Amino acid sequence: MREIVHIQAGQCGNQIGAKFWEVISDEHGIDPTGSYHGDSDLQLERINVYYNEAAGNKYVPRAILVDLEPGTMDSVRSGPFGQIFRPDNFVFGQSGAGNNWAKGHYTEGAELVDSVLDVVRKESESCDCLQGFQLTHSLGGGTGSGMGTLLISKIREEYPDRIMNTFSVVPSPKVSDTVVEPYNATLSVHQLVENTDETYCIDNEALYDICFRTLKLTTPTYGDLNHLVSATMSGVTTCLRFPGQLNADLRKLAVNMVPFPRLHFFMPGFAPLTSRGSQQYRALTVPELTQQMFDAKNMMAACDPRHGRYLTVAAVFRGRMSMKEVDEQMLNVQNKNSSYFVEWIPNNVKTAVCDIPPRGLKMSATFIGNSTAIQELFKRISEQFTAMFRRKAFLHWYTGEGMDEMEFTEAESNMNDLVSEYQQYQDATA
Amino acid sequence: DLGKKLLEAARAQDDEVRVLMANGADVNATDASGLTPLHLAATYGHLEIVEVLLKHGADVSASDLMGSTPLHLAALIGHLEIVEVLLKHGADVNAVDTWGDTPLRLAAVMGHLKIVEALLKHGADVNAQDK
Amino acid sequence: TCVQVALRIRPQGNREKLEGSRVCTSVLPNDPQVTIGGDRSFTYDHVFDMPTLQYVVYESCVEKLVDGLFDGYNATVLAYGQTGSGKTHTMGTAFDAAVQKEEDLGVIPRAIQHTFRKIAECKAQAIEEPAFEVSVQFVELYNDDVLDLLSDDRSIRIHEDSRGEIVLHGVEQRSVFDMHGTMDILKNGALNRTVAATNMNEQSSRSHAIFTLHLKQQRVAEMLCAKFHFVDLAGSERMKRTGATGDRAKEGISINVGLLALGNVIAALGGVSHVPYRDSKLTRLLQDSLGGNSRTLMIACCSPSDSDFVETLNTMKYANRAKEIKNKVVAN
Amino acid sequence: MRECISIHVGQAGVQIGNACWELYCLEHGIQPDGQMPSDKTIGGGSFNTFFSETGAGKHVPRAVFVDLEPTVIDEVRTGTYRQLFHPEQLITGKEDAANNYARGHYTIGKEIIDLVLDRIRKLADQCTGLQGFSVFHSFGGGTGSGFTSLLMERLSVDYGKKSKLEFSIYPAPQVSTAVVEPYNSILTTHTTLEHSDCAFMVDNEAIYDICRRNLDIERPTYTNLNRLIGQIVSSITASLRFDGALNVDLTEFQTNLVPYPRAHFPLATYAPVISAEKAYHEQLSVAEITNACFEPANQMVKCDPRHGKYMACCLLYRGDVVPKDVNAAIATIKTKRTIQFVDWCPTGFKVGINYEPPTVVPGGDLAKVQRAVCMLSNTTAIAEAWARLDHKFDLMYAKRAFVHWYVGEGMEEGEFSEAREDMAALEKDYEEVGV
Ligand SMILES: Nc1nc2c(ncn2[C@@H]2O[C@H](COP(=O)(O)OP(=O)(O)OP(=O)(O)O)[C@@H](O)[C@H]2O)c(=O)[nH]1
Ligand SMILES: Nc1ncnc2c1ncn2[C@@H]1O[C@H](COP(=O)(O)OP(=O)(O)NP(=O)(O)O)[C@@H](O)[C@H]1O
Ligand SMILES: Nc1nc2c(ncn2[C@@H]2O[C@H](COP(=O)(O)OP(=O)(O)O)[C@@H](O)[C@H]2O)c(=O)[nH]1
Ligand SMILES: [Mg+2]
Ligand SMILES: [Mg+2]
């Protein structure tokens, strides 16, 4: 299947999603003007997955840009690559969503969708072969969580037989201390469970702790969190963007990764962890790109992978190395640590490889796991949700907006079930 | 009933709060929840009205029907100012609602680190997790 | 406190006979066991062989359940098996414009008349009549949408109750007063069930239908509510035998996906810590039928022929384990 | 002359058939454009039945290459061999079977199965006699497993009279592209069983290890395995191209190798595997390369033939092989080695010899040897490999892991439990002929 349509919604989504477009444009050799100036034929070979061609050998991404507020799409036009994006695929309104799921899902934005959809339809009738869609959105509340989980639903009945995946940033106290945030995650996670084929769990709590206790950056900006994010959306998509054999398309990756239909949530992982300061420590140990990915402290989700079992892992080493120490030492991680991979899924760890790394790095790995450790993520948002719910705290921002208390109770049943399903398979046997 | 309307002024209206009390409206009125006006003002952030109510006879430790004190609620939402004012007027830190929690844990779970410090000064407990 | 399974074998059909198919199933006279293809054997609570008429089915296993309604005890009767094995005919969720009734009337219809007789049978007394409110709702799950069969359609939602039970919001729940009118809503609902033809059945069910009967009673020492679900499942299909294509075959896939999710739910309850109810909307709608707070009969339907062998094996293999399933019942 | 048609299905099928026709062309001095030097034409009596002659002396393989995605056959359409094959023979779709057996057999396959049939019709309507089809596919691929079984069902109702030989890949984790390959392998085996007459399975691990110590390739690519695999296929199809004594017809494969209908999975063993690296190498006598045919390191499926009973042997020699010395080596396996046969079956060792010098790829890793051999034992010990595969299958099916991808793609759940029980019966089939 060839070509992927990317949509970015919300403030967060539009910001990471533009860093995404920025980074992979470097890897591929498209400059802000859309002309190719790269030093490989390997870069142009599968360029059509994320870019369209045009008059003059120009390459304009397949992104829709979506926001209920303009203030995030006026500043991206004013960024390095806001020139290249097509102008008709900027779909802002003005209302805003007050960091409310209901306001994005039902009130405001329910009027801006069916405008987003009409350009979604547009870029997709140009497709020889559609893989599906990727959304960059935030789970923390507002135009990205509520419109985002409305786009995803309305896109599913129109293209039911296409793959839906998301990069879904997960809210933490430690980053935004916005009281109303555990509500809008449990409202989004309810919809992601029903309607996505795979979700990456970029968890702002994890990104905070890496930027503060690993990178030692005492006051973390949205730039330093996003840096760690864009390095991850390069790894987890590289298999889609360069020629290769393993997890090469959205559907093949889903079929390698999702054992049970509902457990389609992955925690990423990245080695080597870097800051924007641009100090590059490398060869400080080389085969142990295998012990770094598999470490808690390199995950992008606040989960200790040792507190459960892996179900499907996908390691992707980028750079210039030996495909033969990669093999040996990835077979070692699985046989030092044999209990941490479920047994009723034999050969559950697949290992791809790439020959071009990102800029900055001579060698870099990337990690895509379906671990049951992930339940620390949801149990965290479960407890913070149930705290705010039990006291009916702030519940009238939503009932006011043509919602209902049962959505709240329902959305908490779903994710709590998710938790115990992950916990059955974290403990199964024979 | 004026008490109902003072309850709705505390959720929202600092002017209309002292105009409704000088008409003889119950400081310690309750809704069906059991929430008094000092409750509804310490959740939703209003510092002035929180103190106004306290200079005129509010039970700083009144629980609702699920055992919620004014500082339980004030810790949950943030509102460190309202937590301190509530503490100097004799508020119970080590008090427990019908769910088993304490205003400490409500402030841990939600990440209001500024407040968990203050809470721990005037009294902690051993129900919660070590952190 | 535990799920009843009953298995019911149909007579060979005209295709089967005229095509050379032959009997491999074997039940003994007045015996709750069955034997298939010689070797492999199973016992149930009931086994009704190929000439068992409709009223024999009702009395032996369903008469008790309808009673228990008046005793505030919920019940379930779901038919489960392969396409063309007699699910819809057994349940009584289908009606032919020109046959006539002609007796031969399924579970749901006979269940109506039972209800409306024990109501007046109770109303007769010297100590003053108990008042009853009988209502009905009637949905189909067609390609992962809950459609309402009681209305002029085009949505609906599935949520958990206050006691934790599964309630359908946005489904018409209209009230009924005697046999003749409860019956006429059953016919006009069946008129809306999505049905079309496959090579395995000229009237193949393209959805799962649930006829839920509600009976809130008020009497002297109290108030006794009890729901009763009548699930007429779509049968599992194989694309090579149905001949399905397009809109047809898509229906057959989403049927199979939900019967998959019913499979694992049967296995987890018996066969442990989790039970995959949320894999399908079908298995959410059945979450109290199999979980608990229903009294549940499974009527498992089987072709007798050997042209439907491995299929009847599967049906039997799940039916057998389903006996092991603990329903936990309380009066409402 | 009676013709054979090659169908190559799915990625492995296509890239192995590409390596096969490469070696075929070299073996009859045909060029990558179809043309042949008149130096190598004969007076009629050109026993290429795998090749079709046209006017202007182009030789066009009797082959159909089929993939549900376009990338791999695209690399046949613009490579060295864009000239050899007619484009009609090269059929692609756009969406693959995302490593899903059910996509290939039930949904994405049913949308391209008619066009394949009717193109493969054009190769057949141009044959005067016809024996059937040599079909190349993979057990773990989606199209390999799933579409192949759909083609066999239908090449068996059309051409019901015709013989069906398959060369089948058996997956190894060292080159696994996917986790459901055990699902895919037991699925394609159950549905194809009743439609194949003989099936030589190629364990990607067996080949991978042979490439690792005999050719000393450390991390082998598909291009190493295919070179080596392209060899053993040519030893099989030597007779069908060189008017030989043994296996003259496709039926005689079934005649010699497979007595019982379901137990039709022989064990190919090959020698010598000699690296082009070695500077000087004393070529290996018939007696040497025949004793290597009983060394388990050289077979193409991992199992212990010693733990199992033989029920048919054929040995196929190639090059400078004198027939007297063949029988000295054969009579001495019967004494230097203990090789038990089925309680009820003739003991013998058919022999063929080909007298043509083994060809290897020029500038490849295999070294041109002087007398090679390829034995095709049919052992009960190959049941060992079906057990490996069955157990991996069992581990996941216990949990219904991944099944929901198959049922959502055309399948009924019971098909899984059914296909798995054909196997339970087959492991019992190998249990009863021997011991
Ligand atoms: N020897 C050899 N094995 C291969 C080759 N290509 C793939 N394989 C094996 O084939 C299996 C995967 O099957 P594929 O052929 O790639 O799948 P497919 O037939 O293209 O069908 P799709 O899943 O639809 O893409 C794996 O076990 C690989 O080990 C090849 O060129 N040579
Ligand atoms: N015991 C029986 N005696 C007589 N006719 C029967 C019996 N069981 C089934 N039939 C007939 O068999 C045919 C198919 O039965 P049906 O009740 O529609 O089965 P089904 O499982 O619901 N098929 P499907 O809806 O696609 O799963 C109809 O013509 C019925 O009248
Ligand atoms: N990592 C990261 N998180 C962000 C960014 N912008 C907002 N967030 C987070 O997203 C949540 C707020 O959601 P936001 O995207 O602003 O809501 P929206 O504009 O309605 O979609 C909070 O948890 C923030 O911590 C960003 O650029 N990077
Ligand atoms: Mg039916
Ligand atoms: Mg392929």
Short mmCIF file of N, CA, C and O in Angstrom, two decimals, chain C residues 4 28 44 72 74 87 97 108 111 113 116 138 154 166 169 176 189 204-205 208 220 231 235-236 269 281 289-290 298:
data_model
loop_
_atom_site.label_atom_id
_atom_site.label_comp_id
_atom_site.label_asym_id
_atom_site.label_seq_id
_atom_site.Cartn_x
_atom_site.Cartn_y
_atom_site.Cartn_z
N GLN C 4 -27.58 -23.22 31.47
CA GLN C 4 -28.13 -24.40 30.85
C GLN C 4 -27.84 -24.35 29.36
O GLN C 4 -27.99 -23.30 28.74
N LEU C 28 -30.17 -41.09 21.83
CA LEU C 28 -30.93 -42.25 22.26
C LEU C 28 -32.29 -41.82 22.82
O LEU C 28 -32.46 -40.67 23.23
N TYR C 44 -25.58 -32.93 27.30
CA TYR C 44 -26.12 -31.61 27.61
C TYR C 44 -27.22 -31.69 28.65
O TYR C 44 -27.47 -32.75 29.23
N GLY C 72 -39.26 -12.01 39.71
CA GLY C 72 -38.18 -11.04 39.65
C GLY C 72 -36.83 -11.58 39.23
O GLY C 72 -35.80 -11.00 39.60
N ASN C 74 -34.35 -12.41 36.09
CA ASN C 74 -34.06 -12.26 34.66
C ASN C 74 -33.67 -13.59 34.01
O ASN C 74 -33.17 -14.53 34.65
N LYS C 87 -31.67 -21.68 13.89
CA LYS C 87 -31.73 -20.61 14.89
C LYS C 87 -33.02 -19.80 14.79
O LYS C 87 -33.84 -19.79 15.71
N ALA C 97 -45.00 -14.20 4.82
CA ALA C 97 -46.23 -13.50 4.45
C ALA C 97 -47.32 -14.48 4.05
O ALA C 97 -48.45 -14.42 4.55
N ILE C 108 -39.95 -17.30 21.32
CA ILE C 108 -40.48 -15.96 21.60
C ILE C 108 -42.00 -15.91 21.57
O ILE C 108 -42.60 -15.44 22.54
N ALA C 111 -43.57 -17.67 24.34
CA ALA C 111 -43.21 -16.99 25.58
C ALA C 111 -44.17 -15.85 25.87
O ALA C 111 -44.55 -15.63 27.03
N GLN C 113 -47.47 -15.72 24.98
CA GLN C 113 -48.73 -16.28 25.50
C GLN C 113 -48.57 -16.82 26.91
O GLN C 113 -49.51 -16.74 27.71
N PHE C 116 -48.84 -13.60 29.28
CA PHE C 116 -50.17 -13.04 29.40
C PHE C 116 -51.19 -14.01 29.99
O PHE C 116 -52.30 -13.60 30.31
N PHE C 138 -36.57 -4.14 20.84
CA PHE C 138 -36.25 -5.16 19.83
C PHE C 138 -35.24 -4.64 18.80
O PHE C 138 -35.62 -3.97 17.83
N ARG C 154 -33.18 6.34 10.91
CA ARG C 154 -32.51 7.34 10.06
C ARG C 154 -33.46 7.98 9.05
O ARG C 154 -33.17 9.04 8.48
N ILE C 166 -26.04 -3.86 31.51
CA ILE C 166 -25.90 -3.24 30.20
C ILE C 166 -27.27 -2.72 29.79
O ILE C 166 -28.25 -3.48 29.72
N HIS C 169 -29.21 2.83 25.41
CA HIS C 169 -29.84 4.15 25.39
C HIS C 169 -30.23 4.55 23.96
O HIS C 169 -29.49 4.32 23.01
N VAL C 176 -46.87 -2.83 26.01
CA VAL C 176 -47.81 -3.73 25.34
C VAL C 176 -48.81 -4.23 26.37
O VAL C 176 -48.54 -4.21 27.57
N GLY C 189 -41.26 -5.68 13.73
CA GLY C 189 -39.83 -5.68 13.96
C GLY C 189 -39.12 -6.65 13.04
O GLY C 189 -38.10 -6.32 12.43
N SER C 204 -31.34 -15.97 5.13
CA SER C 204 -30.21 -15.91 6.06
C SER C 204 -30.26 -14.63 6.90
O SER C 204 -30.43 -13.53 6.36
N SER C 205 -30.10 -14.79 8.21
CA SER C 205 -30.09 -13.64 9.12
C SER C 205 -28.78 -12.87 8.98
O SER C 205 -27.70 -13.44 9.20
N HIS C 208 -27.75 -9.92 14.38
CA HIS C 208 -28.19 -10.60 15.59
C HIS C 208 -29.35 -9.82 16.18
O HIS C 208 -29.23 -8.62 16.44
N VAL C 220 -48.66 -7.20 46.84
CA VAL C 220 -48.71 -7.00 48.29
C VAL C 220 -47.72 -7.95 48.96
O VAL C 220 -47.41 -9.04 48.45
N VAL C 231 -32.22 -13.83 22.10
CA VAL C 231 -31.18 -13.52 21.14
C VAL C 231 -31.24 -14.55 20.02
O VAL C 231 -31.13 -15.75 20.27
N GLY C 235 -25.67 -16.99 12.14
CA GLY C 235 -24.81 -18.15 12.15
C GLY C 235 -23.46 -17.86 11.54
O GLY C 235 -23.33 -17.03 10.64
N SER C 236 -22.44 -18.57 12.03
CA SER C 236 -21.13 -18.52 11.39
C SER C 236 -21.20 -19.04 9.95
O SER C 236 -21.93 -20.00 9.65
N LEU C 269 -14.93 -18.08 30.59
CA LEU C 269 -15.86 -18.44 31.67
C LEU C 269 -15.92 -19.97 31.73
O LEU C 269 -16.83 -20.60 31.20
N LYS C 281 -19.61 -5.49 20.04
CA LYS C 281 -20.84 -4.99 20.64
C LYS C 281 -21.77 -6.14 20.99
O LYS C 281 -22.55 -6.04 21.94
N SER C 289 -26.05 -11.79 30.38
CA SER C 289 -26.50 -13.13 30.02
C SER C 289 -25.48 -14.19 30.41
O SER C 289 -25.86 -15.24 30.95
N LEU C 290 -24.19 -13.94 30.16
CA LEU C 290 -23.13 -14.91 30.43
C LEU C 290 -22.34 -14.63 31.71
O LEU C 290 -22.14 -15.53 32.52
N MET C 298 -28.65 -21.81 26.63
CA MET C 298 -28.15 -21.76 25.26
C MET C 298 -28.82 -22.88 24.49
O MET C 298 -28.71 -24.05 24.87
#
